[PDB]
Amino acid sequence: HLIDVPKKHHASRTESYVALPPLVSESLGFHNNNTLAVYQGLVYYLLWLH
Amino acid sequence: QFKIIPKAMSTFPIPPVSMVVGNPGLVEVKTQGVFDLNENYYLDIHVS
Amino acid sequence: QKLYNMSGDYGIPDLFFLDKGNWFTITVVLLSHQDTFTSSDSQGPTINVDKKLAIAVTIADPECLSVTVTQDVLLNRNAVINKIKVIDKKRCSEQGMIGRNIKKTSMMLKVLGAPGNCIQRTYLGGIIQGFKVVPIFIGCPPGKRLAFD
Amino acid sequence: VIHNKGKERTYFSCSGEGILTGLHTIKLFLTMDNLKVRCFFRNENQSPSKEILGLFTSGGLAPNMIITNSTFYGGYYFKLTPFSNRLEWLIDIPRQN
Amino acid sequence: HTLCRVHTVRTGKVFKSNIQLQGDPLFYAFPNTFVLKNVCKADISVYLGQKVFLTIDNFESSLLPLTVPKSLAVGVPSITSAHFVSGSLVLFVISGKGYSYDYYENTWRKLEGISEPVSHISGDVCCFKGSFCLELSNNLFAYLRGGQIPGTNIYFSDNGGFSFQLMNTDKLSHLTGTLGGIFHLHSMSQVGVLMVENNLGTFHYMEYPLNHSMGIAFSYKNLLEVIMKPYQRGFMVLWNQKSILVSSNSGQIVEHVRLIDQKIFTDLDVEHANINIYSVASNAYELAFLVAEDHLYYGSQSYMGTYVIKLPHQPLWSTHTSIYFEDIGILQVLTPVADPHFAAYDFDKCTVNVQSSLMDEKLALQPCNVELLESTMINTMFTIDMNSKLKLSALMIPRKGENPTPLVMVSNPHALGFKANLNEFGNTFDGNSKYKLDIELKQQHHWGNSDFNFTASIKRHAISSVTVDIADKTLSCVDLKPLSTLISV
Amino acid sequence: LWRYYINSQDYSIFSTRSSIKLEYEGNSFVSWKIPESCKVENTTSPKTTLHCKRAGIHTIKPIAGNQEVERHLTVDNSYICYLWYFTVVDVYYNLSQIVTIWVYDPESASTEELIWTAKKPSLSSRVLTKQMNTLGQRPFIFTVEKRLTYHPGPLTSEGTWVIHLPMSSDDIAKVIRGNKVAFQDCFIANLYFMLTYPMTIISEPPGYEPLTVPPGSPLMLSWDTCISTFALLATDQETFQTNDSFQTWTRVRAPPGILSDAQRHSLRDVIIFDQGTLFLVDGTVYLRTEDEFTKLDESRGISETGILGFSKRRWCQIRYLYKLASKKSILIAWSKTTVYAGYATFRFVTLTDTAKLKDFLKLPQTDTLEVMSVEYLWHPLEAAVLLSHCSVCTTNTRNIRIVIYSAIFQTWTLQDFELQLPKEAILEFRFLYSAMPDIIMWDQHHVYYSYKNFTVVGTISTPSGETNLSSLSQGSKIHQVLTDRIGNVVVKMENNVMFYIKADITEAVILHTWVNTTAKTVVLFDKSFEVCILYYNENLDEKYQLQTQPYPLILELQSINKDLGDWCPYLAFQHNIHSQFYHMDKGESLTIWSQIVYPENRGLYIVVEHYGSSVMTWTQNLEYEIASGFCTKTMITRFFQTTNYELVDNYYQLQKENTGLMLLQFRPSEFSRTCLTAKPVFEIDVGCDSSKYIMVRGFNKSRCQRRDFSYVIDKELLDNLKV
Amino acid sequence: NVQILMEAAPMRSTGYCPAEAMCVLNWYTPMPFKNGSVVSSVDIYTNGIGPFVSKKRFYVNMNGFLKRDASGKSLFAIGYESLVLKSSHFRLSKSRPLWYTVNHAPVFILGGFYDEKSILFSDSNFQDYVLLELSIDSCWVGSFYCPILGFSATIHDAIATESTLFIRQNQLVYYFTGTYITLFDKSHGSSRWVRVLP
């Protein structure tokens, strides 16, 4: 057993971000090309701000 | 939150509880599943 | 959002960064055979456990990295719990900035006789244990930025 | 709460004395009156005994009753009463409870 | 070979030392032999038999017999009852009159309070450090066994045992037949008497909790000798030549004894088994008796009943032997041997390791079902005031396969109410899981889960004992003692 | 008759990678019989080598014309292979020492390193040392009595670590340890050693004459009580003294005209100190130093031609002896009617005569009461004397008693002995390593024992039960008896046959034949506490007249145990006692931790035994656990005092009443052979050591140099003072 | 070192779709890539619900040899795709190693065929083996100082690194550079291969 190690992302010196697709109110819950373009723009803004 | 305890040889890589949703269109389900030292499985689900 | 503190991977950390006297520890726990020791092992005030199940650490570039290890035995649970503490020796790796002063150095942790023979056989295959190499980079890492209050 | 921890024995035998059913299970029926149930500790001797009840009621131990629905949980406590006369534990619950 | 290997202890006979006794010796008034042990000063002990020996050591060296110095006319020096009061004093009943003996000194004192001849001295000794139960260990009863309650006189003392005063007979007016003893049942914080109306007998309680109340009657062939367990948990052992009973309660229920043989239990009747028990040794949790036909029986006394097994054979009975619990899991057979060349007695001892003893394949006992039971409440004693609650904790780790059922109980439920939660946290490196149980204790009335017939007042102080135990613990669990503590409201 | 040797003294190294040299001596020899797992080189030779990789026990027997016994040897897999080698040098100007350390493998080392005569590491040792520096292994030295560590510098051109070390003479015991870096699945064992000032053996002037034992008598040997490998040995032809384990020796002789030729061949006993040597020549005491050979007389407080014996301490209580700050007796002599306590500088007063002891023991006077042997027990400030009592004589039977004398209290006590022995038998007694006096004594035909506070008193007997050792050794008398810290007692015969005893064990073990009947041999100790046999024979080239060979007593005992069938009742016993002397003041307590691990329910516990004038209280907390079919019992005990000195009278009197020293020992409940555990015995003293005091900051004795001062202060006192 | 965690999205692929609502369906995910790196390790793993699916790692990093013609379709600046993966090519050949930097190589190159001047250049870890025919002439040096006597158009020792790519035909080292913007500049975008070290 290996225990009490530091958790990886704060000791191996990495930087993390999250980006989740927006909630779509469609009954099927499927996206479209338009909303994925919106998602791509949002993840671009996240990377830019990073 | 649930705890799962094996009594025999346990599947370490594959989690042993598969969860299924009857209607995914009205509910949002976020799941976390972690392992213990003796393969005790801690799972927790948030439903909205 | 940007992930400060979360619930990431378990297991061994991949690599390491160090800067001027900081350190880290790994605590290892071994469970031995049911009858790994006999009454003939009672030879001194403390049980000698190195003859059967011992843990060793080897360092490279030894004049810049120090390692201190210490065991403890609980024979009721057939366990040996040990702490390995690795510290910087405050020399080498000349003064620099951000991405220059770093020198790479791989330390090895192992338990004697384990490598090759033992294996954790799980569902879907088996993984090799008893011998793990961790790399550290001495110098100074990214992330440490200075600002004006 | 370990679900498959292992249950193999029925330590209690309870009855409401209104409708008798199979002694292997405890089925109770609720009507307008107070639900009145007499219960005893079933052991190797299946008859009620004043010895085991007196042993239990000496350490401040009294039975407890958990009723559950799909959305409801409730607990009811058997009263601590001296064992000088009784043989089985008794409890009566108002319907509005 | 098995069980014990004998060992003889004798000192003081190195050279020609002229040591002689002076006075009339002391002898017991019963065929059986006994060893009375002090509670916490366990080194001091009294062996009562054909000769009486008071040892300050744990029966080491050579001991001269106890002697009356003839300065006071004791008549026939027969001892009927002995007791250990707090301090360096021991009380004896010689020829119906009470006497005090100091063993650090050589002081004899005559008890002047008693007038009518008594036969037995009774009392309870708590020796927790402090000043609380030092006063509790001062109330003592003096009574004559086998007498008629209408007419006989019974004395008590609250100043230890200095002066004895007869109590009024108004309280005992309505009890008819023969008394078997009066006890300060501090587990109930009550006063109880044993009463023999007929061939069967019962128990009576004085104080307002269960006043004028009764226990389940039990047979009373011949007389009985009554032995308390020294932890104030109310465990009672009543033995004589041809019977033995165990009261798990404080006399409310007195039941028989089980016997384990080939994984089946049977009730043990001494007369029907055609045996005669010779010696009885009682620990805080354990019990053992030597049957005069060279037999030894050991039992663990607990709730739900007592299981008694027969130890392997060894010729131990030698007309003078006495068993006593040297320690938990350690029995000791002691036999004094005379020596007229130096006019002194040496001793022969067998140290019986019962834990090592109960592994014979002919017995085949199932091992312990619990791996660890540890708490920190056994060291001290706890007090409660009103509108105040307290909490205690314990940790238990069970065996790999079995499923033991723990249970916590209170000696006196009338003035002590509990709520215990047992939650699982963590697990050991093997895989066995630690369980932590915490109990919350307060007064019984504040819970509100008792009748007015059961609450029994709130304005008066009382005393009880809290015990955590395993309900389905098997035998061979000698060292894993259940946890017990003393708590005064 | 055959035997075997191994390359290393330390038996922890012994594993499958080692080699065993098998040597058979005898006219008739055929071959060797081995199991299939192990291999012998040149199986038809009486001298050969044995290599074996599979672990377990192996039965080896040399098949020959006569009957040769077989031997079972245990080989176990070990991860400790390498060993430390160190070489010291002493400088006096700085009053320090310098040590050079390197790593050597016993299987592939040089010959000189195997006998501790090397000054430069060999090629394999140097390459392995630089490999250990490369992988990163660094030794360091740790003093035992006071926990101080000393570190080396960098490796030199050759493989050598150089460490400087203060000259202490109070903490003479040290260890050397290393990091946990291993090479190729092999470790390096820690090494224990002792060092103090280098002492000088005497030189020989020309024209001197040897001092010998009487002809036909056995050869004697005596060593220093604290540091071994410094001893003096007397034979029928010469007296030798060694600064080492008799690797190099120097003769000891006498100036002409001091003693007669007949007197020079009547030397009875010898004792060695750092200052000089003491000879008992025909009942007269002679002191030999590097300067003179002076005969002790009445001017120093001794009698002439009346001394029958003398003795010294046997356990190195050097810390307490140094910290006592009071010079005490270092020797005790007895003259059958009077004992003398010899202090330093070899002058003394009479201790006790027999008349005072006769008055003490309430004897009816005019009785034959004699003193015959005095020993220093483990407690530093008392002694014990064997008293022989006639009991109105007219028979051959004499009562044997013991009397103890306490120097701190200047009192006497009589203990419980009931031994009856004839007039002819002479007695020699020793104290075992215990807080409680346990006595092993022998009378050149039997060995009797007193254990467990003089209660278990009896005769050590054979498993057959003869109780006489001469019959099992063809009618010969007891020569040497050696004890140790562990508790194994070794009885050597003049036939050179072997008996083994364990402390608190009645049955003895006859060892297998290892050494010839006619060989002139002695048993001694190496730098460690292992058994060595020294062979002396004249008519040689002066370089092999004294040859030392180690003895595998543990392996022979193991073979005997596989023959018999015994086992240790407990798996393990641990304790936290890391010292022998513990000193604390009023406001501190002492905490001791211990633990036993044993089978499922064989009910055991830890026995704590005490000795002295008890002034302390104990608190004990016990924990019990069962796991994997094994029981673990953990004990934590605390020793403390609970007295108050506020608002009391006779404060100094109470302070003296609540002071002294205590002896404690820890042991299992029941134990037998094959239990190699060391019983922890220690001492606890209360009071001040007179080495702790109080300084104001900024002040010092002589950092500020100044001169003499004089002044007058008047009219301000509580008339004219000149100070 | 930076990492981005995203959840995929559901996408009804457009077509005739005779069914009403559920149809051909494929998860889609955005694709960011920052300035200053080429090596992108993508990790795909299940949400936690649904059928079990394993965890995988892929590398779609920075294929940067790509030029656009007038018609607007992909073209390799090193060579042209003109051959067929015939099983005959390496049915008896030995095993040939694969050389690149320790982790930072955004491409992979492997040749060592029988006689054909072809490599197996591919992104990822040869998950998608796209063959290539190099537009490099087949040259052989001359004499005296030199000898190498057998062209054998089989790029031996085909190595690469970030940006540059090195091949060795018979005594001829040729060096190429892919265009890799946001790493250094537009500058060393090679027109084609160069015989270097004259």
Ligand SMILES: *[C@@H]1O[C@H](CO)[C@@H](O[C@@H]2O[C@H](CO)[C@@H](O[C@@H]3O[C@H](CO[C@@H]4O[C@H](CO[C@@H]5O[C@H](CO)[C@@H](O)[C@H](O)[C@@H]5O)[C@@H](O)[C@H](O[C@@H]5O[C@H](CO)[C@@H](O)[C@H](O)[C@@H]5O)[C@@H]4O)[C@@H](O)[C@H](O[C@@H]4O[C@H](CO)[C@@H](O)[C@H](O)[C@@H]4O)[C@@H]3O)[C@H](O)[C@H]2NC(C)=O)[C@H](O)[C@H]1NC(C)=O
């Ligand atoms: C009862 O048992 C007793 C115990 O054995 C018997 O005592 C024995 O008596 C013998 C004679 O009475 C002694 O034998 C003599 O030993 C001399 C020692 O010389 C040196 O010996 C060492 C080691 O000796 C052997 O080595 C082998 C090596 O494999 C071992 O296996 C073996 O066990 C034994 O130990 C040699 O190594 C020496 O050689 C060199 O030594 C140098 C160190 O100085 C070293 O640097 C170098 O590299 C060499 O190794 C020596 O040889 C022998 O010398 C004697 O031989 C004689 O020597 C002289 C002078 O050299 C010659 O002039 C002469 O011709 C003859 O060769 C002789 O062999 C034996 O030592 C002794 N046992 C012990 C333990 O001391 C007793 O006799 C028995 N009684 C009965 C009745 O049986």
Ligand SMILES: *[C@@H]1O[C@H](CO)[C@@H](O[C@@H]2O[C@H](CO)[C@@H](O[C@@H]3O[C@H](CO)[C@@H](O)[C@H](O)[C@@H]3O)[C@H](O)[C@H]2NC(C)=O)[C@H](O)[C@H]1NC(C)=O
């Ligand atoms: C006490 O005095 C002695 C006197 O000999 C000291 O020993 C000497 O120590 C010095 C300082 O280290 C040595 O000088 C140099 O040492 C280095 C060590 O790396 C060496 O590389 C150099 O070549 C040079 O020798 C000196 O050699 C040494 N003396 C001898 C004879 O070796 C000792 O250090 C003093 N101890 C203390 C605590 O002051």
Ligand SMILES: *[C@@H]1O[C@H](CO)[C@@H](O[C@@H]2O[C@H](CO)[C@@H](O[C@@H]3O[C@H](CO)[C@@H](O)[C@H](O)[C@@H]3O)[C@H](O)[C@H]2NC(C)=O)[C@H](O)[C@H]1NC(C)=O
């Ligand atoms: C080990 O055995 C010896 C030998 O018996 C023990 O010494 C004994 O100690 C006791 C108690 O100190 C002595 O008793 C004394 O009795 C007189 C009256 O007879 C009393 O006045 C004294 O105050 C004291 O109590 C006893 O004489 C003494 N025996 C001898 C021979 O001196 C010792 O205590 C034992 N050790 C242990 C740890 O048990």
Ligand SMILES: *[C@@H]1O[C@H](CO)[C@@H](O[C@@H]2O[C@H](CO)[C@@H](O[C@@H]3O[C@H](CO)[C@@H](O)[C@H](O)[C@@H]3O)[C@H](O)[C@H]2NC(C)=O)[C@H](O)[C@H]1NC(C)=O
């Ligand atoms: C490599 O790093 C450069 C420098 O950050 C990145 O180029 C810059 O990207 C930002 C956002 O993508 C551009 O900002 C945009 O500018 C236009 C025109 O002014 C404006 O309409 C937008 O609203 C937005 O603000 C910026 O102009 C651009 N700078 C240059 C010199 O091109 C580049 O994106 C990085 N490489 C990659 C692959 O991301």
Ligand SMILES: *[C@@H]1O[C@H](CO)[C@@H](O[C@@H]2O[C@H](CO)[C@@H](O)[C@H](O)[C@H]2NC(C)=O)[C@H](O)[C@H]1NC(C)=O
């Ligand atoms: C103590 O008082 C309680 C009061 O509830 C007694 O309970 C009786 O129970 C029986 C049967 O349930 C009822 O018929 C009675 O009416 C109850 N008594 C009252 C006063 O209501 C209980 O029996 C009493 N116990 C003792 C020993 O006196």
Ligand SMILES: *[C@@H]1O[C@H](CO)[C@@H](O)[C@H](O)[C@H]1NC(C)=O
């Ligand atoms: C029923 O509810 C009432 C009102 O709270 C309560 O007083 C009574 O005790 C309850 N009955 C039981 C059996 O708990």
Ligand SMILES: *[C@@H]1O[C@H](CO)[C@@H](O)[C@H](O)[C@H]1NC(C)=O
């Ligand atoms: C005694 O008990 C009776 C009923 O059993 C009760 O009425 C009375 O109050 C009690 N008296 C005391 C003093 O407890």
